[PDB]
Design a protein around this ligand. Structure first.
Ligand code: I71
Ligand code: I71
Lengths: 306, 306
């Protein structure tokens, strides 16, 4: 037993991290087969970032302008293209450590592991969720651009995030691995603000089920609620609406614990209305919303990866 | 910016995990050079665990009784010895993925990453602290024995923990990699209880400095305190005593933020006495004590590993 914010084992991704240097800009790239993926603002300078035209900027580049370090081994670029906000550098060497992989654009509420990197070297790994407002509450310092977020599914790495930028509120914005930003953000230094965030209701419910699986039951009650009446209370506390689809996803957890989903909604309702009154759940004095129903099942049942 | 429970990148350890099977018992082992380390209760049975005599038990074993799977490759055992509560299986093949490594017995309050494993396959990675009562609040299901905890220091993996058992309170106990239990625990099914835990005071202070580095300042005050007067309040809230040595360790963080250590102690005092009053620190509504001063500096300055 026990319940922890658990990241996926990061080794499959560690073997793909490289350093990309162009001009005065150094950041991380992702080396898969013979392509290195990295944020396109690596071709910017200290005065380009205000409103750059990356198409002009890139047409003025030569392959030899791109320094890619894979450890103590320099890779030479033999081609380059831009795809949305990512730059793709074709190198003459295929990464022998390339894992089985996919690129996936995730929905808000979904979680993933972030391998924070500086200068192509991994620094740490942690679990994130894509917030409803398409930011992530990460831990990123200058130099971390190009670090990626991912999930692992049996033997397959599903890359879903590459880091680009930090918003004035201390939260983070980035793209999928095809270079499309999550949310309304753009890779230019202009006024941008996250948008009001909300709590991921289906995830909170998943985590309450995790608590029950693990022996916290103090927050349960004998009441039930309708989805409609629950959502009326959720909206008041700035929770995302719970859909019948969410209810269906919570089926397995509801079945394993014997607590009907709408019964758990009644518990969340009372927790929202009364607070926790000095009690904790799974070591938290807040309602935790960065575990998906799948995360809970994986960790409470012990799924692995080869 | 941002502050997350960050684990070390796990790849160096992933390449060392193997499955050890003896009789009806399967668990994880750690393959370094030509030795596989694993908990000695792999030689027990369903009726041995009540009060086994591992010396008799092991003298009755043959090398061929030990099935070690390294992926889809069976390793044959050519020797075995017991060292305290770990079993050491000499195999005929040195692990080519053996990282640079050390075995270290850590002090309570120190943190480490746990690579949770089942059947030799990594499941996830998370950050733990060794509690003052020598338990860890982990996430461990049946089959996770032999999973290891570690730190990484530049290129070197310092192994500090191997998992053995779960206590009735849902917390976990294990050994160093030389097989010595942390705390008073023994690997036999007899009444054992953790002992009263306490909060790791120097770590809470580190985390308050992390909050200041990251822009939370609401909990600061103009007061100061003496170490003596602070410790009088700490003892009342079941906090570990703060030593002058702890104060010295907090020097770098105090210097970077400009907040004297004892000034931060005055802040913690008021937080203990008044609570947080519905406010959060670094996304927590509890005082967090599983970040060391070193953890804070590493994450707020961006140290990597090759
Ligand atoms: C990233 O480019 C990097 O690591 N590069 C190494 C040279 C860097 C990561 C940032 C730095 C601090 N925390 C992070 O996550 N990203 C950027 O520098 C990014 C690049 C410039 C400006 N960038 C920012 O993140 C800036 N933020 C904004 O300007 N945000 C708004 C106002 C536009 C919304 C800051 C101020 C943090 C440098 C571009 C967006 C192209
Ligand atoms: C571990 O042996 C394993 O994974 N083996 C695979 C077959 C297992 C891990 C445990 C299981 C649940 N959570 C965990 O961390 N450890 C043990 O089974 C361990 C072995 C037996 C009994 N063990 C326990 O952990 C038991 N706990 C106790 O008996 N604890 C007290 C009362 C002695 C303090 C439980 C009840 C959890 C099986 C021995 C200690 C040798």
């Amino acid at each position: 037993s026990g319940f922890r914010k658990m990241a996926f084992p990061s080794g499959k991704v560690e073997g793909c991290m490289v350093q990309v240097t162009c001009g005065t800009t150094t950041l991380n790239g992702l080396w898969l087969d013979d392509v290195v993926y990295c944020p396109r603002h690596v071709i910017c300078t200290s005065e380009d970032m205000l409103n750059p035209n990356y198409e002009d900027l890139l047409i003025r580049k030569s392959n030899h302008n791109f320094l890619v370090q894979a450890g103590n081994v320099q890779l030479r670029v033999i081609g380059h293209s831009m795809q949305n906000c990512v730059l793709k550098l074709k190198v003459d060497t295929a990464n022998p450590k390339t894992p089985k992989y996919k690129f996936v654009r995730i929905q808000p509420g979904q979680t993933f592991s972030v391998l924070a990197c500086y200068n192509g070297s991994p620094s740490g790994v942690y679990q994130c969720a894509m917030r409803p407002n398409f930011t992530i509450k990460g831990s990123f310092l200058n130099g971390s651009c190009g670090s990626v977020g991912f999930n692992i599914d049996y033997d397959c790495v599903s890359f879903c995030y590459m880091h680009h930028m930090e918003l004035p509120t201390g939260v983070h914005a980035g793209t999928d691995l095809a270079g499309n930003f999550y949310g309304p953000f753009v890779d230019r230094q202009t006024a941008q603000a996250a948008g009001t965030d909300t709590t991921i209701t289906v995830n909170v419910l998943a985590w309450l089920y995790a608590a029950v699986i693990n022996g916290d039951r103090w927050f349960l009650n004998r009441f039930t609620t309708t989805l409609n009446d629950f959502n009326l209370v959720a909206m008041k506390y700035n929770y995302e609406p719970l859909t019948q689809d969410h209810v269906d996803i919570l089926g397995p957890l509801s079945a394993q614990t014997g607590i009907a989903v709408l019964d758990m909604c009644a518990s969340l309702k009372e927790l929202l209305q009364n607070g926790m009154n000095g009690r904790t759940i799974l070591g938290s004095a807040l309602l935790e919303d960065e575990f998906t129903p799948f995360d809970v099942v994986r960790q409470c049942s012990g799924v692995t990866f080869q």
